[PDB]
Design a protein around this ligand. Structure first.
Ligand SMILES: C[C@@H](O)CN1CCN(CC(=O)O)CCN(CC(=O)O)CCN(CC(=O)O)CC1
Ligand SMILES: C[C@@H](O)CN1CCN(CC(=O)O)CCN(CC(=O)O)CCN(CC(=O)O)CC1
Ligand SMILES: [Lu+3]
Ligand SMILES: [Lu+3]
Ligand SMILES: [Lu+3]
Ligand SMILES: [Lu+3]
Ligand SMILES: [Lu+3]
Ligand SMILES: [Lu+3]
Lengths: 447, 447, 446
């Protein structure tokens, strides 16, 4: 693998955005072949991020919840077709149709997101909202009426729902007899030798290699924020890239120490399509996203985010390779770093084969100030994600147009905007460090 | 025609958009059957707008310039295929091809807008721009190197160019032997009885029924702005809807007072398609815009704008009907009012036939604040013209998503945004004073 | 009891008012049948509120001071009709008539509030005023001219006076011979087994489950503020809902391990009416508020607030049920939560029988943007407590009008502002995500 290219990419992005620290581990053929730390785990104390640094892993915790569910099913404790009402005291039969365990694992209950995690975490970092659900029990209470929020029968649509996995946590406690955190620690963490993976504040703050979370304010300052303890089965586990390596190894080598291979495969089966089509055909299994078209391979993985911490794990069983990335802020998507490394491992050029990388580079070239014939009319071009904003300069006048890219090339971009029902086009021609923009009746040259 | 309906429309829009005054005239098979003024021609003085109120007509002046060319051509003064260099001393042979009179009239020289008029007027109204071309001579001097601005060969592409008509004005002088203003006055205005159509401020000062222009500032306060004297052949004429009534009559009835009917038809011929598709397949003639599919009819017209004054004239030769509208601000498109009236005259409901009208009504219903489950997350939806903007409420954080309407119905709007290079939908379900928004994983409900 | 309805209520209210954490206990027939903590004890450290969590209880402390006085009276230490001057070195003979122990207990000395507590706490939280009374002895010195502050003869009117209970704390010291803190701990807390109820910071610092106080600033931010140590007899006690359930049990069952039942009945007697009339007839006993018409029952209770902490305790002797709620901010009246629960324990619907509950839900339907015929004029309706404000939009102008709701139903509300000496009426009609407003000559639609 081209380590030089990967490391530059990481440092480049960390500077570009204001990311404090990042840790990464890479598995190949059964062994961890690469594990490094970048930046700081704590800016205030000047503590570096290391391969052993502990970060919140967010929704990566979902796959653990699903694995625990698989084990309980295999031991005959319950059935994937069992209605959730059989295990939890809550109304879950929208339109008369029973939402089952399977529906919850696949976010196909028919109930859109309750926005509970969004409201909760925003408040815990100084935002405007507030949702003090200190325990999953209080979350369930708040969700007493989630049934009335349904907009589709169970099994028809996909709606990423955090509350859904919170209910699965409760289902694990009902069936097993112990607390969710207990079950995960004794049936998964210990048997896998993951000793630096925790749920409790008491054990984390005692560790010596833990990352402090960070949020960038509107002013560009990195503000420290501790983990938002309270979340559990949907995304409350804290861990390191080295511990996630042992976890990924189990899946890749189809190790049957937790469940039989038949069950690991149930988790990797795409059951429903998701709205985030990146490489084409993306779907969802049990607590894992499925990318059947990732550079010629079927990719399996999931992202995580608790606001001041983000992460991503991913593996490709047919190639025996996996990657884990943890970050102490949300400046740059961990999945992108992970996919960059995976692309290099497969022998593909990430700068060319990854849409979100390829698109971002070209669009950045188009940004700047634009002038018409001999400087008559002036314009401003700024990119905000997938969109290109064209704003005519003037303290007192002009408009603003959002442009959608229809064609992206190293030296040419064609976008359209919406004017009177049909699309109006704008073309960007990129050459000798110069950019010609053609829009409607105008011609504008960069600068 | 259902007048009560038309009048309500106009008063309602003038209020909604803060338009100070409007005048309109309607012609039906030979006579002016409706001429009426609305609002104020001068707000500070409390002077009302009347059928005789004088306004700047902007680009409607282009047709006058084109008509004068037709006359000179019918007289053997010049040919439409002659290269411009034959009459004006300036280089106009981009890529080795001669720009002809025909190219100038159809905006097909291959030279995109120089943006001169935008710069000029912006500076004359207090903008941060500045281009003091107080005469067409000065403008031609500035456009000296416009041949190098060319991006296409003559006749292949449409680019609305004001300087193109400034050149036609100079061609009229060279050939006719008199000034552009005198030729237009002597060969068109006078023989058509348009005695209150001027070019010179000295004439305008004498007139007793003249409208002051207005521009709305960043604070929604109407600011008076006088006409920007200096522009001529491309948009410097000032007239009334009654004078334009006599003008439209000539075209409709194919009156040969100035030129043979064969030449009027040359002007109504679609030579090149334009990017202003409203009803489908619109094109450009000579100083006139062609709409081959306007409510099952062929519409001919042209808008005009000098910033503080706007206008429009259009006619349907086959139905012998025409309409003229003048406004002393840029608040509401005069063409929309003119088309509203035309629809009524055609026996059609403008509320169901004109896109720019129902599309505006339907979109308003989606604006407001939306709330997630039990008020967890908040969003505000705002419509700017034809785009729907979805913004998340929070002072610390706040992302805005541009939504483009795809399916538009009375009770359902489906929009899309871009992400990862693919479109992602947002559905708006409108029902009994409330709207349900379904975007990605979320469900948001309005009031 | 319908617990789900109660827990959904609390979470929703905490979200709505930005309350950090709440703890509550419910006692029935001598057993703690329910006790839970919601939200956060300490936001910054992310520690959950629990039934054990300790909070300042504020003026709930007053009932302890009253109980202490009852014991001393029963033991012959003093008389309820004794002038307070007989125990404290201060002038208290407004209008030539001595303020008695009884007068202080009922807030009827004839002396209006000195605003000492308001000034004290305000300054201790970074506010504008300042009154550095670090000890109750200091407050008394400050209160040296209080006699001159009187406006009525003792026993005629009610004026909640915190200094009143400060003087009582000193009286307790004079009679017993020990300090107020020691007297309460040895005579009340210890015999009742209330082992996690404190006065001193040295003790609270050693407790592992304690909440941080919070105050919401003007940007809507929760600002941490530690307990303002210094106050004592009028409201310096810190405790938890589990210890308070033990306290409530004594009154409910009329346990006589501290005083005889005749003295508990003295404390629960309505001696004078209060202006805080919620259900009708509310009065004040001895460090206790009396509600004679609470859902067809006689409720006894008292609230408390120290600024960054609030709480409430209430019990209904006849139904052997009591409730305690503590909060680490003043976002939502803890008495409202307590009464919500008592209503459920009574087989009643709080959503339809508690005024402060439905009135707030209904007045909420009215908030919004209103416009006249085809958008000619714009107005804004915003609710603030009980008053509905109607403002004419438009930057240059934008006057305001206060509207006092006279009639209030599910889909209708009649209010009145004040004109030229007479009441001008406004009516709101609510029907299907729509509200019509008739105000004088105008008709406005939201
Ligand atoms: C968890 C899976 O059971 C879900 N299932 C995955 C595929 N199953 C095969 C299988 O059951 O492993 C296909 C046949 N399945 C028959 C049946 O199971 O009753 C009907 C559809 N099921 C509905 C259901 O679950 O009941 C949808 C998804
Ligand atoms: C049992 C009685 O003591 C009750 N008492 C009967 C009337 N008393 C006159 C009297 O008691 O001879 C007059 C008013 N009394 C002041 C006073 O006693 O001088 C105030 C309130 N009293 C309680 C108290 O005195 O603590 C309540 C009613
Ligand atoms: Lu490089
Ligand atoms: Lu099945
Ligand atoms: Lu030809
Ligand atoms: Lu002739
Ligand atoms: Lu008495
Ligand atoms: Lu005894």
């Amino acid at each position: 693998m081209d380590v030089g290219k990967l490391e530059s990419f990481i440092v480049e992005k960390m500077a570009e955005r204001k990311v404090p620290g990042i840790s990464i581990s890479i598995i190949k053929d059964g062994d961890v072949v690469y594990a490094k730390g970048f930046g700081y785990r704590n800016v205030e104390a000047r503590l570096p991020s290391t391969p052993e640094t502990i970060y919140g892993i967010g929704s990566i915790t979902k796959s653990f919840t699903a694995l625990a569910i698989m084990k309980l099913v295999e031991e005959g404790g319950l059935s994937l077709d069992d209605p959730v009402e059989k295990f939890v005291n809550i109304k879950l039969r929208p339109f008369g149709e029973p939402v089952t365990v399977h529906h919850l694992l696949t976010h196909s209950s028919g109930i859109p997101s309750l926005g509970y995690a969004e409201a909760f975490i925003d408040g815990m970092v100084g935002g405007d909202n507030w949702l003090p659900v200190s325990t999953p029990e209080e979350t369930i209470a708040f969700a007493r009426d989630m049934e009335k929020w349904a907009v589709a029968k169970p099994g028809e649509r996909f709606f990423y729902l955090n509350t859904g996995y919170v209910l699965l946590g409760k289902i694990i406690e009902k069936v097993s007899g112990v607390s969710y955190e207990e079950y995960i620690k004794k049936k998964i963490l210990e048997p896998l030798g993951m000793n630096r993976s925790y749920f409790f504040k008491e054990e984390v703050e005692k560790d010596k290699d833990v990352a402090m979370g960070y949020i960038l304010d509107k002013e560009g300052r990195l503000v420290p924020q501790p983990f938002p303890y309270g979340i559990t089965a949907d995304g409350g586990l804290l861990s390191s890239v080295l511990d996630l390596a042992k976890y990924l190894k189990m899946y890749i080598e189809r190790d049957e120490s937790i469940v039989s291979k038949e069950y690991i495969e149930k988790m990797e089966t795409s059951y429903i399509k998701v709205p985030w089509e990146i490489f084409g055909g993306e779907g969802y299994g049990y607590g894992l996203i499925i990318y059947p078209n990732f550079l010629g391979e079927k990719l399996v993985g999931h992202s995580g985010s608790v606001g001041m911490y983000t992460g991503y794990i991913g593996y490709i069983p047919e190639k025996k390779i996996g990657v884990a990335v943890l970050e102490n802020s949300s400046g740059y998507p961990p999945s992108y770093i992970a996919m960059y490394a995976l692309a290099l491992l497969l022998g593909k050029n990430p700068e060319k084969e990854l849409p979100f990388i390829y698109r971002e580079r070209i669009l950045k070239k188009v940004e700047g100030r634009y002038m018409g014939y001999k400087g008559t009319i002036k314009f401003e071009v700024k990119v905000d994600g997938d969109v290109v904003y064209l704003r005519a300069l003037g303290r007192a006048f002009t408009y603003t147009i959002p442009l959608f890219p229809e064609v992206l090339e190293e030296d040419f971009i064609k976008c359209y905007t919406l004017s009177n029902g049909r699309k109006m086009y704008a073309e960007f021609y990129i050459k000798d460090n110069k950019v010609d923009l053609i829009f409607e009746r105008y011609r504008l040259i960069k600068s």
